From Swiss-Prot:
Presence of keyword Nucleotidyltransferase: no
UniProt protein name: Lysozyme C
Function of the molecule: Lysozymes have primarily a bacteriolytic function; those in tissues and body fluids are associated with the monocyte-macrophage system and enhance the activity of immunoagents. Has bacteriolytic activity against M.luteus.
Upper lineage: Eukaryota, Metazoa, Chordata, Craniata, Vertebrata
Catalytically driven reaction(s): Hydrolysis of (1->4)-beta-linkages between N-acetylmuramic acid and N-acetyl-D-glucosamine residues in a peptidoglycan and between N-acetyl-D-glucosamine residues in chitodextrins
Keyword Signal found: yes
Domain C-type lysozyme: 1-129
Species of the source: Gallus gallus (Chicken)
CC terms in the record's Gene Ontology section: cytoplasm; endoplasmic reticulum; extracellular space
Residue numbers binding substrate: D101
Amino acid sequence: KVFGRCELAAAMKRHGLDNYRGYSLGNWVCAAKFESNFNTQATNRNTDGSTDYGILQINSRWWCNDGRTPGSRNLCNIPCSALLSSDITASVNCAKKIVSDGNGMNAWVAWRNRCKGTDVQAWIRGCRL
Ligand SMILES: [Cl-]
Ligand SMILES: [Cl-]
Ligand SMILES: [Cl-]
Ligand SMILES: [Cl-]
Ligand code: NA
């Protein structure tokens, strides 16, 4: 599913990401924009053999099981395929654990490089939320 900008903001708020760990909704929408272009089916293979899945491009090295990342963990206790669903619940629940792991949203390199220190509120501006 490719979400609209305001549609995704509302779904993220629905699932309790707005201001989760102090990160306003616009940070999460901006991260999703640059990780996946709002596409829940996004996947991207990394040089280490791990794969990133879903609208927040959650990586199989630590967070989900895909059966093909040797030595990896599954800290969200989910198959990586669950992160590709049109329902964002699994991606949100896993993102909450990632963002709580010590480095905040810096865990998403694209957030650090493309959202951090910008006017992230622009990503939710105009939306009925
Ligand atoms: Cl915001
Ligand atoms: Cl594996
Ligand atoms: Cl949803
Ligand atoms: Cl933080
Ligand atoms: Na894994």
